[PDB]
Amino acid sequence: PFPTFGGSTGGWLRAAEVEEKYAITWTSTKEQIFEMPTGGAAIMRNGENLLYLARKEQCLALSTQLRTFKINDYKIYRIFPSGEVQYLHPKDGVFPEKVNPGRTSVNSRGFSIGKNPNPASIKFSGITTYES
Amino acid sequence: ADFSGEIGAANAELGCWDPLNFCTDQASFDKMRYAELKHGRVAQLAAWGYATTWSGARFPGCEDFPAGHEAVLKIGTENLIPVLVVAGALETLWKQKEGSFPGDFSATSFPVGFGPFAKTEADMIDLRTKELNNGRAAMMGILGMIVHEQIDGKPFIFFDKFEIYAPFGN
Amino acid sequence: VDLDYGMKNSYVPATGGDGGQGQFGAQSPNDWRVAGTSPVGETSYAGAADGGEEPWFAEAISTVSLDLQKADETLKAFTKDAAAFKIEEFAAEKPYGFTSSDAAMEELVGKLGYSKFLEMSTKQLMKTWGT
Amino acid sequence: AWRDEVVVGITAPVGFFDPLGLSKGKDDATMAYYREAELKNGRVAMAACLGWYLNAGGVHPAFNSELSNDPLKAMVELPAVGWLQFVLGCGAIEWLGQQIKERPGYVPGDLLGASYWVDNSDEGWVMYQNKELNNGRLAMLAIVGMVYQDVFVGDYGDMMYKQL
Amino acid sequence: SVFDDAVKDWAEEYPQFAAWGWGPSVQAEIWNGRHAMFGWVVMCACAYAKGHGLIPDADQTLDLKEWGTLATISGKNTITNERAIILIANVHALMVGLAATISPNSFADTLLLDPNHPMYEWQMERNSKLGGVMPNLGKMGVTPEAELANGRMAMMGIITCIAYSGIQGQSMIDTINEWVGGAYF
Amino acid sequence: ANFIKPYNDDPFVGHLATPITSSSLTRALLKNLPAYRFGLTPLLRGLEIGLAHGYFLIGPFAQLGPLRNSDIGLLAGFLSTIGLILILTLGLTIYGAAAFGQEKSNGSELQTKKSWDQFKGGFFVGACGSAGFAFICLSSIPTFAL
Amino acid sequence: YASELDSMTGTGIESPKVFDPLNLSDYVPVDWARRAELSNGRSAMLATVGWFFPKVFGTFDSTDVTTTDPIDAIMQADPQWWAQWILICGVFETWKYKKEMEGKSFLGGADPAVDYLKLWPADAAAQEEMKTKELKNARLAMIGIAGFAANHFIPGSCPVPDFIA
Amino acid sequence: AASFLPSILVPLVGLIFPAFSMALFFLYVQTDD
């Protein structure tokens, strides 16, 4: 289900084969030309499409472009060398910009930025003021 | 038909290199093979002889004769006739062994054959191939020499004559 | 699917100045520091791809890929809890002739697929499961 | 059968050209040797032609332009060390070529391995290949003609188009 | 004083080097000893040549033009031929040593103990049973034991020669000649 | 006709199959080079590589060095080459230690500690010997004149 | 000494049992030793002849080397000869490698690596006997070349015929 | 003689010492205790 592309010297390297790799998938209603983050132009297929990239940002950048084409069914995965796959985005099925009941707060401090502790107070502690 | 199996094939791919299709059937091939061998053996001796003489060596009683084709033209025919007589006799003596590769004279009166030189079949094929190949080379060589002799007088092209190192012969 | 495969890495968070393993782990379990190319008929990066007659460009031979079928499974596994929360709330709001959470899930996902199910409010779900 | 498959080399002026029928009973291997020889002999001829022309013209800016403009005289003037390098270098390439030939899928004459990207189905490819062959065939005859002129007639320059 | 303790302490303080056999180890004792034994020959040869005037054109300095500033001791002053020749002889030997260090055989005693060399086990074993204060007789002849004993002897001699030379205020070459009976000179 | 295609038919890998990258000539040359050739042992691989690199290195030093015009110029050139070989050998040793570690198992894989050590040794012998060969050859240069 | 020696060619009439008084077999691997024994021996066999051949039977027609003393000629000979000599030896060494890899043997194995005269016996019995003769001649030659050199530098060290010198 | 020391030590201090030191640092920073 690979989109039609002729190849580039800006594709993935060894890290994709020995450390980690990424993959995005989407469905289209027409064959159209899009610009790939790696560099160049490609033609998507009329239906399912799969593409591999080396960075999550590269994948999410393409998603932005896809939204312009009115495609909002994209999914991003991380494939480890052993074959293990992790579903990353949309994580809970709902885009992050939309509040979804069932998501808990993380890394939240209940005070204004100016209420953090003084650096000297936490000296020889190992923690930082913003983590204190 | 397929003479690729025959000894002396150019190489595995080309098989038998017969550009003009002289050979058509086994009968012809045998004829051609016999001829090639005869010419080859004769040539191998010829090159040896030409070089020896041209370099300067002469038999007792032949110290004033010239060398090269010039000899054939100048030296007395009477002293050349012996060659024909000693060759014609051999022509009669050599006896081809029936049911054997062209040029096998094992059936000759005097003992002739692979004797102690060859043991396994492969050894025989090797020796045979080498005889043929060296003959092929000499055939070209003797010509090359004679031609150049006529062209410039230098039968060896790069040098006038050979110098031998025969310690025991001294 | 081992949902902790990524978390199970050699990374050890430091005291101060580190966000941590986050949600999906901070580093790949595997070490990128593998060797270079090898002579014909030999392998270097463990489960590497044989370069055949071009060992020099072996690293360009892909061996890591995503199976579309397998892709479905990873989607379901990593989103299992979310689905659970969703159906639970639907159950709490007095479902019409409710049966079993799982049963309801199957019915509700039989229609509206699965992705659509994950993106629907309990209200919409109840409307959908009115029948 | 080579005759039933060959496409390159057959052009318009004469079509298939074998008046003496030197390829009637030859097998594919022999025919392959012939094509390879044809191309090699021709390609070398083309190069030789260019070399002769440049030297004759006087554009031989090497060795302080010491060597003669006559191409055949110059060869004699060249030190042997120069010739040895030439033969040995060409010999090296010949070895590599043999390696390529052994590899499966070898198309007689292809050392760049263009078979990997293009086949004879493409007319453009076959046409361009024909141009190499045709020019090579002509060059072969030319180099033989020029040598005659230099060795017998006594000239090593154009005696045809020189008269404006 | 127990020797063993000191060696242990060194290993602890400098573990990385100790792993390869560097430092106060049997390996070092063997190799350094072998070199000292060999040197004695070189030093005696030098003495003989000096006394018998064998070295060609000694007491003359190499040309600063033929050779370069590398041959200068101070300013334009250059090294004498004798010292140069002695050095070249040693360089011949050092080259052999470098080859042996960088390109060891499969049945050779490597300078350092390498787990990936086939002779590692034998070397480890030999070293494990070659330690003592007194030479172990009964293993005379060509044995690892004899080698170590002779090596220690040679190394001690070097120390003694230097000391005696200083006490008597003489060159080491002179002391050598003296201990031989004045034969060389 | 397109002479440039995606490498290994993977449109997303960062490489392309150009005539330079994948031609019979390039493939043949690289396949038979000592580094990638099939069957060569680690030692032999190093030896061939060393023999090749040592022969051409004596030149630069001998003809352009500080003592080029001296009668002992060629000798000096040889010594200089040996010095460079030693530096390169140190590098090889150090690389192996860091890249491969301390104990190995696979064996006969240029990419292991034991194999690398053997490779390094071969390089040293070949390089130094090759330089010596050049010294002998450059001592008397043939004019090839009849 | 190493046990394998008991099952190898080399022991004979003048040496009924394994001769390794200093047990060098313990250190040097048995295989390498035999390979080296033959290599040094074969080379020595050739040297012996070369030590006197030029003197006794004459020299080639050239003036590069004027002396006949075996040692002196080493430096008189043009360096180009020496380079080519190293090359030919390298070629020989390569041949032994390639042919050995083809299963052939240059150490008394079943398939000869170099038998241009085609005189390698087929029966193992004769093969064994043939190998023994070579080893002997080799050992004798090594001793001889050493002896020649000895008398050359330290006169009287060995009883060498005058012509051989 | 002490006068020879400049020509015996400088080669070592400026060439041998720096090399070994750099090598050791590399091995130290490339090792994973």
Ligand code: CLA
């Ligand atoms: C190296 C020489 C050489 C070789 C090997 C070939 C080989 C081939 N040519 Mg060819 N050709 C050549 C030179 C050569 N050509 C030249 C110089 C011309 C220009 C006139 C042509 C023009 C030509 C045409 C127009 C056609 C061919 C074709 C062919 C192929 C089929 C015909 C055949 O089997 O010929 C067999 C030929 C040989 C086995 C070798 C040639 C015979 C040698 C050269 C004998 C020398 C004769 C000659 C008179 C020597 C004197 C030259 C000079 C001194 C006057 C075959 C592969 C045909 C083809 O491509 O079909 C696929 C085709 O249609 N050729």
Ligand code: CLA
């Ligand atoms: C970068 C430019 C440059 C160049 C070309 C030179 C050139 C030279 N310097 Mg110099 N130098 C330079 C910068 C340069 N210097 C700088 C910046 C300094 C200040 C630190 C010095 C300080 C200096 C000193 C103090 C001395 C020199 C010396 C020398 C000479 C000895 C050459 C030598 O041993 O190299 C050895 C070279 C090599 C081992 C390798 C050369 C590179 C190879 C040939 C590249 C091959 C690439 C290949 C073609 C790729 C394709 C391969 C494929 C076909 C298979 C030479 C004339 C010495 C001398 O006598 O002066 C004349 C000397 O004593 N230099």
Ligand code: CLA
């Ligand atoms: C204190 C440090 C030091 C010392 C003692 C030297 C000494 C020398 N340099 Mg130098 N150099 C240095 C630092 C130093 N350099 C630095 C920092 C740079 C970078 C800018 C250079 C760049 C440089 C260049 C570019 C050149 C020199 C050259 C030379 C030599 C010229 C004299 C001579 O006779 O050449 C003639 C050469 C000889 C007689 C050969 C001597 C034998 C060699 C040196 C043996 C080396 C083996 C050595 C032990 C290997 C090291 C192993 C490793 C573990 C350290 C001389 C040996 C020139 C030369 O010829 O290099 C050899 C040259 O071209 N140097």
Ligand SMILES: CC1=C(C#C/C(C)=C/C=C/C(C)=C/C=C/C=C(C)/C=C/C=C(C)/C=C/[C@@]23O[C@]2(C)C[C@@H](O)CC3(C)C)C(C)(C)C[C@H](O)C1
């Ligand atoms: C203080 C202390 C202790 C101690 C101690 C003591 C006594 C320590 C003393 C150690 C001592 C004194 C060790 C001598 C070494 C001499 C060497 C290595 C000579 C090498 C010589 C070599 C390598 C020869 C080289 C040459 O051949 C070459 C290279 C070139 C030739 O031209 C010339 C020569 C021949 C020269 C206790 C009590 C034991 C334990 C306690 O806890 C700590």
Ligand SMILES: CC1=C(C#C/C(C)=C/C=C/C(C)=C/C=C/C=C(C)/C=C/C=C(C)/C=C/C2=C(C)C[C@@H](O)CC2(C)C)C(C)(C)C[C@H](O)C1
């Ligand atoms: C001593 C010395 C010097 C020297 C020196 C010396 C000896 C130098 C030696 C140089 C030498 C041997 C160079 C050798 C060159 C050999 C070549 C190209 C061979 C090509 C073979 C080919 C294509 C084979 C093709 C095939 C055919 C068709 C049939 C097929 O079936 C199979 C197959 C077999 C594959 C110098 C020159 C370095 C100068 C210095 O100062 C002094």
Ligand SMILES: CC1=C(/C=C/C(C)=C/C=C/C(C)=C/C=C/C=C(C)/C=C/C=C(C)/C=C/C2=C(C)CCCC2(C)C)C(C)(C)CCC1
């Ligand atoms: C441009 C080009 C090319 C290339 C060229 C080149 C790059 C060359 C190089 C070359 C080289 C670079 C060579 C080398 C050589 C080397 C040698 C030849 C060596 C030798 C050595 C020896 C022989 C030995 C030694 C020794 C040892 C081993 C040790 C002991 C001692 C002795 C001494 C024995 C060609 C033409 C292909 C084609 C076109 C392109």
